[PDB]
Write a protein that binds this ligand. Structure first.
Ligand SMILES: Nc1ncnc2c1ncn2[C@@H]1O[C@H](COP(=O)(O)OP(=O)(O)O)[C@@H](O)[C@H]1O
Ligand SMILES: Nc1ncnc2c1ncn2[C@@H]1O[C@H](COP(=O)(O)OP(=O)(O)O)[C@@H](O)[C@H]1O
Ligand SMILES: Nc1ncnc2c1ncn2[C@@H]1O[C@H](COP(=O)(O)OP(=O)(O)O)[C@@H](O)[C@H]1O
Ligand SMILES: Nc1ncnc2c1ncn2[C@@H]1O[C@H](COP(=O)(O)OP(=O)(O)O)[C@@H](O)[C@H]1O
Ligand SMILES: [Mg+2]
Ligand SMILES: [Mg+2]
Ligand SMILES: [Mg+2]
Lengths: 76, 96, 85, 438, 445, 310, 65, 418
């Protein structure tokens, strides 16, 4: 049994590929392979084109007061 | 999942047509790795003896001021992989 | 409290028989509850459209099978709240 | 019903057909003629059986159809399953997974068997009564008792927890004839002495019974484990080696592993733990090996773990593969100096007729004497293999016309229907332009 | 199946009961001697008592070699394995050429396994232990049977089972109203969900509720499974379904063909022999068809000697349209069919001859019938004359363009003018070669 | 603006320029001259569109600059995007990962399109309340803009809901047949004004209509895509990476049989297409030998080839 | 995206222990909310290789990959 | 004791033996003669150390056994360990793991180094007492001059628990990382003397290849030891080059161009040469030094003849240094240097005979005969090598000429004669 090899390097080397978020764009807008197994054709084709939010709806919901509390169930 | 095999998929029951397509004889002619290990137990006990002359841990990377997120990420990845895979490596215990 | 598994050789010239012995009646009841057969649920029907029920409004617990039936049920519940208070 | 093994080219060869003095009989064990070559093969077989000289090479050389592979199969059948016999083709060493030297090493080490003989205590008896008491709920110590019976004994055994678990896993019931190995605790059921209770349902058709074992309960039996050097190398190369024994995919085994295994096998041999069973590697059509493979053979035969190597080739002075050098048998002279050559002479008329008779006997085909004469004439004119094929073809033609004995008319019919190489080449010359290239 | 391929009209060899070949039958025209030889070979395959026999179909291109092999395949039927293969397929990036050939050899040997699967279906109505009036040991309760009541669409049956099944019942969590099946050959209880009659419209479970089983409580059937030795070999070399780390690695890693060892193949052979002796399985030796055998190299040809000399090998049919060509992998060695003389000594050669103009016309008519094309007598004669020059393939390939052109022109049959126009539009090999020779300067290379 | 498709060597070609009688116009749809060649291309195009005959091969031969690739692009344009048109060069079959014959088989199977049609019942709504008593039994409340109901959950449904971390305000769809749950989005409330959002969260409107819905999906896939999907456990990843390897012939036979079964059941339709190999003279003799017998299958597309060699 | 990177401890807490294996970083200078409008050039090959293999993934197959 | 570095073929070369004007000395630093080649090598060394011009290539060409590799090794020795000096053979670029162009790219990037200076706090001392309680803990460390008790944090407590540390061990701790390495026990290494906590300046020279491999993938540094680099993407390499340029502009790092030596360059094929033609045109290209003894020879991979087996397009970018054959005086001086290296004492008559043998056959043959004669002298209990021992080893071991003559005498007995 031998001790392992301790390979020492400059601390700056480990940050060579790192790019600050304010210096890089979002690469998730081109992620096609990430959608497989998670996103369905229904969501892309039928649901989202119909039930996308609009600025008007978002503003209306944000500005409107809180909804009334949900009524308690009643055995009727 | 078992496409084009003598072993049939997990048929829900006799109501499914796959239940009456495959035979147990074909299943018994295919041995999983665990069955192979159980089949070669005496051979493994008697004939597995070769040891490496030297044994070393993997090389370690040391930096004076490393990114403080790399080590916790590697530790978490190793922990998750070990928790998911170590139970499956128990059959190879005698070989190791 | 133990469960005894017993296999014997008894004349029939011989046949094999297996027995399971429970030390206490609690274990026997636990392993063999002798549950009665379940009951078939009553096929509920929508009071508004008389079609077979497919939904169940949580507030009123009234099954329904149509969006119009749901609206009518909610209107009736609102009227009941207004009247009774 | 037909087994997986059917009538092949050499299905009639049961051995070299020699006597005690290694004098070849004229027709015995399928072999006919080739007296000198069979005597040499018998000498080589005795050398193999003695198993004292490592790395001996024999070359069976002769014209096509002279019985080189027949002699090799006769040697293999005379050796028996106890001695390893690895038969490969020369083309098989060219592999995309491993080097040629690695393939040759694996072929050599598949021809050496390591045998480990040990004595173990064995309990074999009829289960009379088995009782297992386990806690109803939670972890606890199972307690059990087992009664085993022979024709002259019956003992009641107190069972431990692990033996209880083994018996539960094997689902041992009353009337099962079971074998228990005391050391490893392995339990093997080998039959039922009698049926189960009839009142039970969903049990299936009861099979035949097995007579109860006699003698003492706890006997001592000799267990023999035999593996080849290649199997040891593969299972020691990596953890997944046991799977590599079947999937191939062994890659290239490190030389360190093989050196360690050689040392350990030598230690076992010195200590009497294991015995080495040298065998034979038979490379058919050895002329397909290239110069590098031959150079590796040159020094690989100098090891003490090398088996007897038997090669067959029908080449004259031919270019060695990978070079531009003409050499006898397609083999470099350096390797040809390390090997004894066994020549096969061509067959006469009577030898051909006797081979045809043996083939007909093997294929259960009845043929007339005139048909035998015509077939022997065709075989002498064309080739032996063509006559051998016409045997079955004429059998089928005769059976088609509701006959019982193959006549000359059937042989003429199959001679017209199926062509040899010579007549095919003539007909191709007659229509040379119609064929594509040259 | 609905699409019409080049050999869609070949329904077998047109042989009389006496083996003589009819002039036109089963979609084949002419080639009487080759058809008779192929019938003898079919009888040889059906006899199932010969291994490693080889047949070479030798003749000029476009003479029915592939058609004859497919006719043999039709004669044998789907029960007999038939593994087509081209010579170019031995060159693989994963396994060696000899391994590809051995795998195809094992693909050609089939195995038919017959077993009876007896099962008991039903909805569990009753679960009652059968106690004994004399408890063993004095204390507690002992049980000797467990009565299980199974209910189906058209019956209800009770099964007095072994007491040991109580553990399987508890492990499977089987209760009343659940649908289960019990296998006689194993004595195990499997819960295939709960009956659908106890499900309400407000439940959201997907695989929990199952319909009440149809038919009788006791269902038994004979299962016939057809497998090949290569299927078992592959299933044992790279097993799928284990829960160990090696199976996970196999699933993760890219699948790759491997060089199956002789040890595994010997084990498979032993298992097959055991099954045959037990009566479970019946061996079905088939045919390996290696088209374009001339594309094999010298290593493949050399390996084929040992492959054919084996007692497990199938009956191999070769086909080559080459003349005195140079063997691939060798430097300036010429052999009569591109095949070394050592392998030619191991084969029976079947010669296919060229077709007379009448036979070409018959084949064109048959192909037109197969393609659903009505052709006039004059158009058929003109197309046969076109086939006298050029080749037969050109004539049989002008039928569908001519049919399309006629349909566009508004006619339900091919006339001579349509064939002439198609001949003008499309050139054959010889005319194109003449054009190329006349303008070799303007072309490339 | 400048899109990714710009003026190329064949951007001016929109079709073969033929009339209803397949008579080529002198200059139509961007093609000039080559009257006989264009008429032949139109005949081949009608043969492709009919789809009755399998494995037909046409070679466009001629001097360089005579319009062979022009005619191939015209055929591709005239043929609809529905019908597959795999255009490869001869050099592309020499791969370091798979053999030449495997490359040709994959090219053949990429040229046959299979249009699938699956109809599935789903439940679609916004989650109002999830109550689970103790992971044994629970209730789920879903709502639309016009409906609201409560459902009784089992063990597997509860496990699936806990695995996907479905909570209040989430708009989800549940497949009735399989029970799989996919989350479409979450509704927007006054309390959900996040300053930072996860990479997968998105806000959608509450669905309208009825809670039970039928989902119909129609897509065109090739035989090669089904082969790659069923080659390994996550074979759909190889449809992106291309690390397919050599697919086993047994898998291909199984997939052909399964596709025939779908076609009989009405769940799929076959659209045979065109395989265009440009500069075929780069193919080796082995590749030509394989092509000889590959065209003889009943699942072989139309093979159009183009060479300028003498 | 919601990505979080913990880039060390604040240097105001550097003296909370006499010996810890921590990387202490100065407090950021600007505002908590930082906005920057950037123009970054990518090539089609970058998107191809970005979509050739999956990234992340808590499944066992992804981790082993 | 026998260490790994024994006496090799160039062990006596310690430099180029030049003065301040790059004028070579007749015998200095193990080098004898070849004044012109050594002066050219010194000029090339000055060019290397200046570090301004990138991708300059020099070819050392000459007859076999004319000091080409000696000149290269002397150039490597004259440069310190600070400047990278990658020495490969032409055969090494032919790999099954990567392409030839990838192998040459890795060879180039191994020759350019990035020197980064950073400051770290290092605690080195002897453990007195370690206390851990259920997390909080205390650690007491001592030197020969001071003792201290530390209040430990969670991460350092975990690090000290992972690496078993007990009283009496002498350990060093990297404060920022917790990297604890036990360097012995004291009551064997003496306890440290001075201050317990020291701020140290650590300087690392990291090659571009090392940066690429470390940043290629997670745990990618392992490929620096086991090959397995594959073919690194050009995007990663371009990003690393850009980041290194940013560091150089910002002062965070300094570039140290080095030397790539390809002995027996003639083994490269036309593809590798064409790649080198443009790889030398980058601003990150190192100095390329090649050696070959070929005359007008076929370029590997082609059928063309060219002066060195190198295509003329590459030769036009090279400066060629020609090595001349050695004289009798130079041969005798080289033999004396080799004898001093091997600790062998010879008589002057033995030296004269050996010089005649070396001139007649080869310098390397005489160098080889030196050790054989020393062994023969030691066999007969002698202390100084005589002419008789040299003649004995001359008879025992043949050269190429006499071996060829004897083989031609029995040419039929050998195998595959042309
Ligand atoms: N002396 C012999 N006795 C019996 N059968 C023989 C003899 N020689 C050849 N045969 C048979 O003839 C057939 C062809 O001979 P084979 O050994 O294949 O020739 P080759 O030496 O060219 O390989 C084989 O089936 C073999 O069994
Ligand atoms: N005797 C025949 N009867 C009917 N059709 C034939 C006959 N011979 C050939 N054909 C058909 O003509 C075409 C020629 O191909 P084929 O002759 O099989 O090529 P090859 O000669 O390479 O085997 C095939 O599609 C085949 O179906
Ligand atoms: N009939 C045509 N009509 C319009 N453009 C043509 C025609 N024939 C050739 N071209 C143009 O000439 C160029 C070269 O011809 P192309 O068919 O692409 O290659 P080649 O014919 O040499 O195989 C193309 O850009 C194509 O647009
Ligand atoms: N000028 C020199 N000074 C000292 N030693 C030398 C000199 N020239 C050659 N040698 C030595 O003699 C041997 C000759 O090898 P070398 O000339 O480097 O071969 P190559 O011609 O292949 O470069 C080497 O061991 C080297 O150390
Ligand atoms: Mg032979
Ligand atoms: Mg073109
Ligand atoms: Mg040198």
């Amino acid at each position: 049994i031998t001790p392992g090899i301790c390979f020492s390097t400059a601390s700056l080397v480990l940050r060579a590929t790192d790019v600050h978020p304010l210096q890089r764009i979002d690469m998730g807008r081109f992620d096609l392979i990430g959608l497989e197994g998670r996103v369905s054709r229904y969501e892309a084709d039928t649901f989202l084109p119909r039930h996308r939010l609009s600025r008007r709806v978002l503003l209306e919901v944000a500005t409107a007061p809180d909804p009334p509390p949900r009524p308690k169930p009643v055995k009727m | 999942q078992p496409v084009a095999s003598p072993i049939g998929p997990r048929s829900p029951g006799p109501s499914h047509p796959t239940f009456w397509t495959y035979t147990e004889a074909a299943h018994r002619a295919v041995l999983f790795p665990q069955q192979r290990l159980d089949q070669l137990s005496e051979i493994i006990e008697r004939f597995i003896f070769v040891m490496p002359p030297v044994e070393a841990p993997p090389p370690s990377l040391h930096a004076c001021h490393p990114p403080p997120w790399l080590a916790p990420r590697q530790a978490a990845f190793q922990e998750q992989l070990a928790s998911e895979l170590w139970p499956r490596a128990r059959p190879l215990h005698r070989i190791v | 409290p133990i469960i005894t598994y017993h296999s014997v050789t008894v004349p029939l010239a011989r046949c094999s028989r297996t027995f399971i012995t429970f030390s206490d009646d609690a274990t026997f009841e636990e392993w063999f509850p002798q549950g009665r057969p379940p009951k078939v649920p009553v096929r509920e029907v929508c009071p508004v459209t008389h079609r077979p029920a497919l939904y169940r409004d949580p507030v009123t617990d009234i099954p329904y099978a149509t969006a119009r039936a749901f609206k009518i049920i909610r209107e009736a519940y609102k009227k009941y709240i207004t009247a009774h208070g | 019903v037909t087994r997986i093994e059917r009538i092949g080219a050499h299905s009639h060869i049961r051995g070299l057909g020699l006597d005690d003095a290694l004098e070849p009989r004229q027709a015995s064990q399928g072999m006919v003629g080739q007296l000198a070559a069979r005597r040499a093969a018998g000498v080589v077989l005795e050398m193999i059986r003695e198993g004292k000289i490592a790395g001996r090479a024999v070359l069976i050389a002769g014209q096509p159809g002279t019985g080189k592979t027949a002699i090799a199969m006769g040697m293999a059948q005379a050796l028996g399953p106890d001695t390893p016999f690895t038969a490969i083709a020369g083309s098989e060493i060219f592999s995309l997974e491993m080097s040629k030297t690695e393939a040759l090493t694996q072929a050599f080490r598949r021809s050496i068997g390591v045998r480990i003989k040990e004595e173990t205590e064995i309990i074999e008896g009829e289960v009379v009564e088995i009782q297992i008491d386990r806690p109803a709920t939670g972890t606890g110590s199972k307690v059990g008792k087992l009664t085993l019976k022979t024709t002259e004994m019956e003992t009641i055994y107190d069972l431990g927890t692990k033996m209880i678990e083994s018996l539960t896993k094997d689902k041992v019931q009353a009337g099962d004839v079971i074998t228990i190995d005391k050391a490893t605790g392995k339990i093997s059921k080998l039959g039922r002495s009698f049926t189960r209770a009839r009142d039970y349902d969903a049990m299936g058709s009861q099979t035949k019974f097995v007579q109860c074992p006699d003698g003492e309960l706890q006997k001592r039996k000799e267990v023999v484990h035999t593996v080849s050097l290649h199997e040891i190398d593969v299972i020691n190369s990596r953890t997944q080696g046991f799977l590599a024994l079947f999937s191939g995919d062994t890659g290239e085994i490190k030389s360190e592993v093989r050196e360690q295994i050689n040392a350990k096998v030598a230690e076992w041999r010195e200590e009497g733990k294991a015995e080495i069973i040298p065998g034979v590697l038979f490379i058919d059509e050895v002329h397909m090996l290239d110069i590098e493979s031959f150079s590796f053979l040159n020094r690989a035969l100098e090891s003490d773990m090398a088996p007897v190597l038997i090669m067959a080739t029908n080449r004259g002075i031919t270019r060695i593969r990978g070079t531009s050098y003409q050499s006898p048998h397609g083999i470099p002279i350096d390797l040809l100096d390390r090997l004894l050559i066994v020549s096969t002479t061509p067959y006469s008329e009577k030898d051909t007729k006797q081979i045809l008779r043996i083939r007909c006997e093997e294929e259960d085909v009845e043929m007339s004497e005139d048909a035998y004469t015509v077939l022997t004439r065709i075989g002498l004119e064309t080739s032996l293999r063509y006559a051998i094929q016409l045997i079955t073809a004429a059998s089928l033609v005769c059976r088609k016309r509701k006959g019982t004995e193959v006549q000359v008319d059937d042989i003429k019919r199959v001679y017209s229907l199926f062509l040899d190489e010579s007549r095919s080449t003539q007909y191709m010359k007659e229509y040379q332009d119609a064929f594509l290239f040259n | 199946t609905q699409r019409i391929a080049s050999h869609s009209h070949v329904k077998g060899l047109g042989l009389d009961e006496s083996g003589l070949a009819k002039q036109a039958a089963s979609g084949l025209v002419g080639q009487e001697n080759a058809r008779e030889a192929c019938g003898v070979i079919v009888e040889l395959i059906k006899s199932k008592k010969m291994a490693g026999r080889a047949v070479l179909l030798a003749g000029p291109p476009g003479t029915g070699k592939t058609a004859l092999a497919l006719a043999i395949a039709q004669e044998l039927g789907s029960k007999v394995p038939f593994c087509p293969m081209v010579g170019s397929e031995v060159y693989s990036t994963e396994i060696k050429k000899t391994e590809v050939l051995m795998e195809n050899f094992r693909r050609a040997i089939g195995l038919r396994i017959k077993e009876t699967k007896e099962v008991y279906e039903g909805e569990v109505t009753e679960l009652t232990p059968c106690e004994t009036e004399n408890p063993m040991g004095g204390y507690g309760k002992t049980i000797s049977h467990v009565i299980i009541g199974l209910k189906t669409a058209k019956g209800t049956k009770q099964l007095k089972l072994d007491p040991s099944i109580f553990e399987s019942l508890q492990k499977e969590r089987v209760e009343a109203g659940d649908v289960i099946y019990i296998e006689a050959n194993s004595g195990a209880v499997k819960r295939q969900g709960r009956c659908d009659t106890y499900a309400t419209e407000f439940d959201l479970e997907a695989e929990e509720y199952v319909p009440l089983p149809k038919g009788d409580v006791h269902k038994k059937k004979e299962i016939i499974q057809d497998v090949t030795l290569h299927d078992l070999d592959v299933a044992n070399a790279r097993p799928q379904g284990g829960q160990d780390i090696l199976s996970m690695m196999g699933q993760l890693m890219k699948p790759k063909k491997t060089e199956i060892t002789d040890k595994l193949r010997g084990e498979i052979n032993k298992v097959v022999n055991k099954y045959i002796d037990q009566g479970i399985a019946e061996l079905v030796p088939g045919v390996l068809f290696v088209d374009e055998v001339h594309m094999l190299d010298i290593e493949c040809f050399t390996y084929l000697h040992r492959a054919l000399e084996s007692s497990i090998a199938p009956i191999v049919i070769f086909a080559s349209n080459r003349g005195n060509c140079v063997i691939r992998g060798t430097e300036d060695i010429t052999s009569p069919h591109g095949i070394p003389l050592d392998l030619l000594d191991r084969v029976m050669i079947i010669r296919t001859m060229l077709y007379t103009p009448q036979e070409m016309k018959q084949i064109i008519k048959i192909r037109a019938q197969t393609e659903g094309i009505n052709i006039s007598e004059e158009a058929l004669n003109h197309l046969g004359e076109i086939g006298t020059k050029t080749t037969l393939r050109y004539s049989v390939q002008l039928l569908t363009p001519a049919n399309l052109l006629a349909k566009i022109n508004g006619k339900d049959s091919i006339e001579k003018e349509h064939v002439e126009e198609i001949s003008e539009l499309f050139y054959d090999a010889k005319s194109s070669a003449k054009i190329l020779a006349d303008q070799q300067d303007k072309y490339m290379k």
